[PDB]
Design a protein around this ligand. Structure first.
Ligand SMILES: [K+]
Ligand SMILES: [K+]
Ligand SMILES: [K+]
Ligand SMILES: [K+]
Ligand SMILES: [K+]
Ligand SMILES: [K+]
Ligand SMILES: [K+]
Ligand SMILES: [K+]
Ligand SMILES: [K+]
Ligand SMILES: [K+]
Ligand SMILES: [Mg+2]
Ligand SMILES: [Mg+2]
Length: 1334
RNA sequence: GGGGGCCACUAGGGACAGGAUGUUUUAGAGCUAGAAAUAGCAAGUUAAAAUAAGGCUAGUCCGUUAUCAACUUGAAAAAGUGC
DNA sequence: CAATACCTATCCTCTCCCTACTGGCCCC
DNA sequence: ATAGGTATTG
């Protein structure tokens, strides 16, 4: 008994099928367990396992980190209160107690209800004097009087609890504050550099213009308008643009060749400036640095909108400005509405449901919603011009706690905190002794390279302690070994050398590693001249000369430089031909040139004695990113360089890691030669062996030492091995389920292993990324397309509009503008044709007015289009609006277009699966099936694991009319698995030589033709560019075995696809995750509310509702009834929530009795996860959606004729026009299939769905559109299956009629139905008659 | 075919440090005419505290990912059970 | 019970490691 | 975006 398995792996399904020699699917009697009268059941060996998607770890991580941050903010406040304890006790012995119980109702409060002062008079007086906390903050910063200790605490706690960001290193307010002064200093530096072309900046109000609440480019235009004879793209204009945060190109300002694009935000600017300073000199450095200072000024002016010379609290003063303008504008608006629109006053200032001022302050209206609601009211009235100005500036009736306060640096809060401490430490000595402690509470961050400050109970922690004691912000540098912790931070994530598994890999920018790469590439170079008989390798002397003369003098080395600067200058060759490198060398000595610029000592870099030192330096500059730790590590080399060089060296940093270790590159030595790997690369006689040849040569000891150094370690489990794969967690869930399915199927066939296993793997918020890409590309481009055409992110889900914006609103084949409103008239063309590369992504698509303008449609765009559009394409490439691959494909005609080789490769790619994750699945299955070794100690491959791409079975379905319609049911997953088994086995039988291509384990016209016509052996007649005909029976050429009988096997496939009994199994899963919805609802007199804290009664304090049920339990017990508490027997479903799960499982009986149940039949407790299957009458099935709701549990097995009719009639997906005509004729001849399909659906619904209202609405809708075209009627009959689909009910639409979901809001009936426990395949069942309980 | 190093791209996964809102209860004395219902007017911008209930290992740690039909024997892990 | 309509926490900065899609140079 | 919870209305 022989058989094969077909598998279809998806992100929510695993289809599976078993086939015999005749491509038939067996059927077996399977024993049935339980307490029903049924002892067995017939099952076909085909089905599909369905499951909810596997989830990433991201949301869990975000919740975890927010948890940690809440804890640490609480600890900051706790430190501060601990500092204030004794003196506050002297002042007010319950202040902190009133603060801790502020949330409690007065009934539950243990102290007076007024928190600050404890009496109503003083509290009202405080609120009258300081209506906001910022009033008190400003007062305490500015005033000189002794203050109440409680108000000091409140100010400092407000600064510490909400302390602002840390995006700016160092100190702040370094007199970079004033915009006028930095603008005048920029003018002075510019006039110093250009005495002939000076700028008259007199009468220019730089403060108002540059600090104006306007866009960057608008403020730039405003400032340039004040400068006659100066344009926005000149030098001064570009400096102002750089200071405003734009991306000015200083190429044209200085007549440069290398595109000097500078933005102060990018991390590359530090290099992008030095690069630039490499051309025009260092005399312009002062100018750009002054511009950066001005940028700092404007950024601060965005936040501090008040004069910094009237107060040391400009932030608090700016919040007070917000408050005062709010008060004035509110008084004015109230009076205006009273006078002009008196009937709208109540809706505006009293209705919290409306988005007026009432909903803005008391309701749920945002600032944006309130502005939208009130803009027409202001425009409609008179005297609202200034209010409209403030509204369009987004500065009208502003609150102080707002979404845009994330701009505030922590240094500003720190300045105000330090000012208050300076004021009040003259009266409170403990503030003087603890001033720096409080400042440290504010300023201290746990460094990212340290992680959780755990003590051996955090699987996320890696920190090591210098001493075993509690870590505080004041003793961190002493208790925490920041060095060891920062080293572990990187070393716990970096790879070891695979060749030497005990050695750490080198830094990517290690001098040794780059020497290795350069010599490795250089060794395989070959050259010819005239008198030479044969291409020769470069000798060791030649390679050293090339390294010293070219690689150590140019950051990049081109083939032109190799021909002229070496072969001409040294060898006296006027003509030379080179092989092994094209255009320029890929490897380069970048770090050599970095360090040569920094230390300016070439002899130091060339001396082999300093190697170690340099290797350490780079190592440091790669391990660490904190400049203090880098300084502490480089201190051991302080004697070798000047303080200038040491400063530059500590400023330089690297990221990235190589893939080989130092001990492999330049460590282990061949036994006889005594030479390392790099020694062979530098010189190897006339063999010139590279890395692979060196470590694979049996006449050397490298290979044997690699073998010896190898270790294997502990083997992973199946689950561990799958978890460690590189892929999406969803597809890994699919992979694990696939392995389990295979195990069960092997057990079904009596532990006999299959002949073949054919596997196919399906292909695998976002508009936010689209808007980000378009914004960055248009700004980098310098275009105003978002100015003239504003777009929202959702709109970018239209392909043509997204392409339009990615192309700057221009045709890509013609240098012309494109119209937005005409996008329907344009074309979206494939760069490389889809007949070769089935790529439908933006990476291979292009928006053009007419695809005819691409050239010839059989290839890549023509040379003429490339000549026309290459510069504009490069512009789109540099703005990252197109990728470099899209550009390269567009420009392929410059390189000869598509050769025959490329077309052969594309067609082969369409059929041979090369994705790595599918290879890993194949390896897992192959290693589980084939375990024995032959006489030569080589693996015996009893089971051949074939992998296929989806297009094979897709084209099979479309060519032999085995069509699929996904919306009818879930049977198509199983059918895909079956067709995979059939096609794969038949293909490898017909052409065994293809095993290397399709089975796991170890001329261009010819291969193009062959792989194009690989599947023709199924057809009877083939029309290929005339008509040929194949025999009825197809056999193998060598064996003579039969592979395909076209008269009988197609009927077999049809009968298999027609079978109504298909094992669809929805994986039952316990629900995990959040306890409930996250909304903190207000107080309500409902027992659905859940306390947010143990003592916070939700009837007083509000709380959560809508908990998630982890799983239900069947309870058979008794409950007290009525005032007499008489015991009444019950049987019901109890939903154990996620929050209750641990309590219930620790002791189920106590939990159930606390819920009210008595005399619980402990052995009748049945655990029922989500999707538990129940069968009722007439084959009607239900799945558990919760403890109080049910999902549909049956599959509508629509006959095959109706499925294919729906496919063809709906124009689901063509072929010859004669075959199109035959299909159309079949549609029109079987039009009565519409009524027959409605009849099938109606019978199914009346038997199983039981939604009378919805079914009647659907029948009326179908009888309403009987005159509609067959196309639309079929397309909407497709929608109708939402009523019958397995799973949760969902709303659908038949034409314009909407059918809302009929839900099953009660689970009482399943308590007397039959529970069905299914194995993973559903072939093994345990059926429990629940009616026999109770 | 499978595999490695390098260059260029493209898409994904995992971890650390931090900020700003939102919400919830309370505090921010509402006033006047009416028995009340109510009417008229005044006012509004701020703060405290919580932000998964909680846990023991008590850390400035952990608490939403992965994994789960049923039954037997098992403390569990784990095996085993049906053409 | 049954049906119906409404509800559903959001945004942002920053350090770093890893694999893998395709194209290319050289090899095992 | 789903699809399960919830109060409201019978
Ligand atoms: K009280
Ligand atoms: K101008
Ligand atoms: K609001
Ligand atoms: K607020
Ligand atoms: K190259
Ligand atoms: K670094
Ligand atoms: K020195
Ligand atoms: K889970
Ligand atoms: K879930
Ligand atoms: K199951
Ligand atoms: Mg907590
Ligand atoms: Mg708040």
């Amino acid at each position: 008994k022989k058989y094969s398995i077909g598998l279809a792996i998806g992100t929510n399904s695993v289809g599976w099928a078993v086939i015999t020699d005749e491509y038939k699917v067996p059927s077996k009697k399977f024993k049935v367990l339980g307490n029903t009268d049924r002892h067995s059941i017939k099952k076909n060996l085909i089905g599909a396992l369905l499951f909810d998607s596997g989830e990433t770890a991201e949301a869990t991580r975000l919740k975890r980190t927010a948890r940690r941050r809440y804890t640490r903010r609480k600890n900051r406040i706790c430190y501060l209160q601990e500092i204030f304890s004794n003196e506050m006790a002297k002042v007010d012995d319950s202040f902190f107690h009133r603060l801790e119980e502020s949330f409690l109702v007065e009934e539950d409060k243990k102290h007076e209800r007024h928190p600050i002062f404890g009496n109503i008079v003083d509290e009202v007086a405080y609120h009258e004097k300081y209506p906001t906390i910022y009033h008190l903050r400003k007062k305490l910063v500015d005033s000189t009087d002794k203050a109440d200790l409680r108000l000091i605490y409140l100010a400092l706690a407000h600064m510490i609890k909400f302390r602002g960001h840390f995006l700016i290193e160092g100190d702040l307010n370094p007199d970079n504050s004033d915009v006028d002064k930095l603008f005048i200093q920029l003018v002075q530096t510019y006039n110093q550099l250009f005495e002939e072309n000076p700028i008259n900046a007199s009468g220019v109000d730089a403060k108002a213009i540059l600090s104006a609440r306007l866009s960057k480019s608008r403020r730039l235009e405003n400032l340039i308008a004040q400068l006659p004879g100066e344009k926005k793209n000149g030098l001064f204009g570009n400096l102002i643009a750089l200071s405003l945060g734009l991306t000015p190109n200083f190429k044209s300002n200085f007549d440069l060749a290398e595109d000097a694009k500078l933005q102060l935000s990018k991390d590359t600017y530090d290099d992008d400036l030095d690069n630039l300073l490499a051309q025009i000199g260092d005399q312009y450095a002062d100018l750009f640095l002054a511009a950066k200072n001005l940028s700092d000024a404007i950024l601060l002016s965005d936040i501090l909108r008040v004069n910094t010379e009237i107060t040391k609290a400009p932030l608090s003063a700016s919040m007070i400005k917000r408050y005062d303008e709010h008060h004035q504008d509110l008084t004015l608006l109230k009076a205006l509405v009273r006078q002009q629109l008196p009937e709208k006053y109540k809706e505006i200032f009293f209705d919290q449901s409306k988005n007026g001022y009432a909903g803005y302050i008391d309701g749920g209206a945002s600032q944006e919603e309130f502005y939208k609601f009130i803009k027409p009211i202001l425009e409609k009235m008179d005297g609202t011009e200034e209010l409209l100005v403030k509204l369009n500036r987004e500065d009208l009736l502003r609150k102080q706690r707002t979404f845009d306060n994330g701009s505030i640096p922590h240094q500003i809060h720190l300045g105000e905190l330090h000012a208050i401490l300076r004021r009040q430490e003259d009266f409170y000595p403990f503030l003087k002794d603890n001033r720096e402690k409080i400042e440290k509470i504010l300023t201290f961050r746990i460094p990212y390279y340290v992680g959780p400050l755990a003590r051996g109970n955090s699987r996320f922690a890696w920190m090591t302690r210098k001493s075993e004691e509690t870590i505080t912000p004041w003793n961190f540098e002493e208790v925490v070994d920041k060095g060891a912790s920062a080293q572990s931070f990187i070393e716990r994530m970096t790879n070891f050398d695979k060749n030497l598994p005990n050695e750490k890999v080198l830094p990517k920018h290690s001098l040794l590693y780059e020497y290795f790469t350069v010599y490795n590439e250089l060794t395989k170079v070959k050259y010819v001249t005239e008198g030479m008989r044969k291409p020769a390798f470069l000798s060791g002397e030649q390679k050293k000369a090339i390294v010293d003369l070219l690689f150590k003098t140019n950051r990049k080395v081109t083939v032109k430089q190799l021909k002229e600067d070496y072969f001409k200058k040294i060898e006296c060759f006027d003509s030379v031909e080179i092989s092994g490198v094209e255009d320029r060398f890929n490897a380069s000595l970048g770090t050599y040139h970095d360090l040569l610029k920094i230390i300016k000592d070439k002899d130091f870099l060339d001396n082999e004695e300093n190697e170690d030192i340099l290797e350490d330096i780079v190592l440091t500059l790669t391990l660490f990113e904190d400049r203090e730790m880098i300084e502490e590590r480089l201190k051991t080399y302080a004697h070798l360089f000047d303080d200038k060089v040491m400063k530059q060296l500590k400023r330089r940093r690297y990221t990235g890691w190589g893939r080989l270790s130092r001990k492999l590159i330049n460590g282990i030595r061949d036994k006889q030669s005594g030479k390392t790997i790099l020694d062979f690369l530098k010189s190897d006689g006339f063999a010139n062996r590279n890395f692979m040849q060196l470590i694979h040569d049996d006449s050397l000891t490298f290979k044997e030492d690699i073998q010896k150094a190898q270790v294997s370690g502990q083997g992973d489990s199946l689950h561990e091995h799958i978890a460690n794969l590189a892929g999406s967690p969803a597809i890994k869930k699919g992979i694990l389920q696939t392995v389990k399915v295979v195990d069960e199927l092997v057990k079904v066939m009596g532990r006999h292993k299959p002949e073949n296993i054919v596997i196919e793997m399906a292909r695998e918020k976002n508009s936010r990324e689209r808007m980000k890409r378009i914004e960055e590309g248009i700004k980098e481009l310098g275009s105003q397309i978002l100015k003239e055409h504003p777009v929202e992110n959702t709109q970018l889900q239209n392909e043509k509009l997204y392409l339009y914006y990615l192309q700057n609103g221009r045709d890509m084949y013609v240098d012309q503008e494109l119209d937005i409103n005409r996008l329907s008239d344009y074309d979206v063309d494939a760069i490389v044709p889809q007949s070769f590369l089935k790529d439908d992504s933006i990476d291979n698509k292009v928006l053009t007015r007419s695809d005819k303008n691409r050239g010839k449609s059989d290839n890549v765009p023509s040379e003429e289009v490339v000549k026309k559009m290459k510069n504009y394409w490069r512009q789109l490439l540099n703005a990252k609006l197109i990728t470099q691959r899209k550009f390269d494909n567009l420009t392929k005609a410059e390189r000869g277009g598509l050769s025959e080789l490329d077309k052969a490769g594309f067609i082969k790619r369409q059929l041979v699966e090369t994705r790595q994750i599918t290879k890993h699945v194949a390896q897992i299955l192959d290693s589980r099936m084939n375990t024995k070794y032959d006489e030569n100690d080589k693996l015996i491959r009893e089971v051949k694991v074939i992998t296929l791409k989806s297009k094979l079975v897709s084209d099979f379905r479309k060519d032999f009319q085995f069509y699929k319609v996904r919306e009818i049911n879930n049977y198509h997953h199983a059918h895909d698995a079956y067709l995979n088994a059939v096609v794969g086995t038949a293909l490898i039988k017909k052409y065994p030589k293809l095993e290397s291509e399709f089975v796991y384990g170890d001329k261009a016209t010819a291969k193009y033709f062959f792989y194009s016509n690989i599947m023709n052996f199924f057809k009877t007649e083939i029309t290929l560019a005339e008509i040929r005909k194949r025999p009825l029976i197809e056999t193998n050429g060598e064996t003579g075995e039969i592979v395909w009988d076209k008269g009988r096997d197609f009927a077999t496939v049809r009968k298999v696809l027609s079978m109504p009994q298909v094992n669809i199994v929805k994986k039952t899963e316990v629900q995990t995750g959040g306890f409930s919805k996250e909304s903190i609802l207000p107080k309500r007199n409902s027992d659905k509310l859940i306390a947010r804290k143990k003592d916070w009664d939700p009837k007083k304090y509000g709380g959560f509702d809508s908990p998630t049920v982890a799983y239900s339990v069947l309870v058979v017990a008794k409950v007290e009834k009525g005032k007499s508490k008489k015991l009444k027997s019950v049987k019901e479903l109890l939903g154990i929530t996620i929050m209750e799960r641990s309590s219930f499982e620790k002791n189920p009986i106590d939990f159930l009795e606390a819920k009210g149940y008595k005399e619980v039949k402990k052995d009748l407790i049945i655990k029922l996860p989500k999707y538990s299957l129940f069968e009722l009458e007439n084959g009607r099935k239900r799945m558990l959606a919760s403890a109080g709701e049910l999902q549909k549990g049956n599959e509508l097995a629509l006959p095959s004729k109706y499925v294919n009719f729906l496919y063809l009639a709906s124009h689901y997906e063509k072929g010859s026009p004669e075959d199109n005509e035959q299909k159309q004729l079949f549609v029109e001849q079987h039009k009565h299939y519409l009524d027959e399909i409605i009849e099938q659906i109606s019978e199914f619904s009346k038997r199983v769905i039981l939604a009378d209202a919805n079914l009647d609405k659907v029948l009326s809708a179908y009888n309403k559109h009987r005159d509609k075209p067959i196309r639309e009627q079929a397309e909407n009959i497709i929608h109708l299956f939402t009523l019958t689909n397995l799973g949760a009910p969902a709303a659908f639409k038949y034409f314009d009629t909407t059918i809302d979901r009929k839900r099953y809001t009660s689970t009482k009936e399943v308590l007397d139905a039959t529970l069905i426990h299914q194995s993973i395949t559903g072939l093994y069942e345990t059926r429990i008659d629940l009616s026999q309980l109770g």
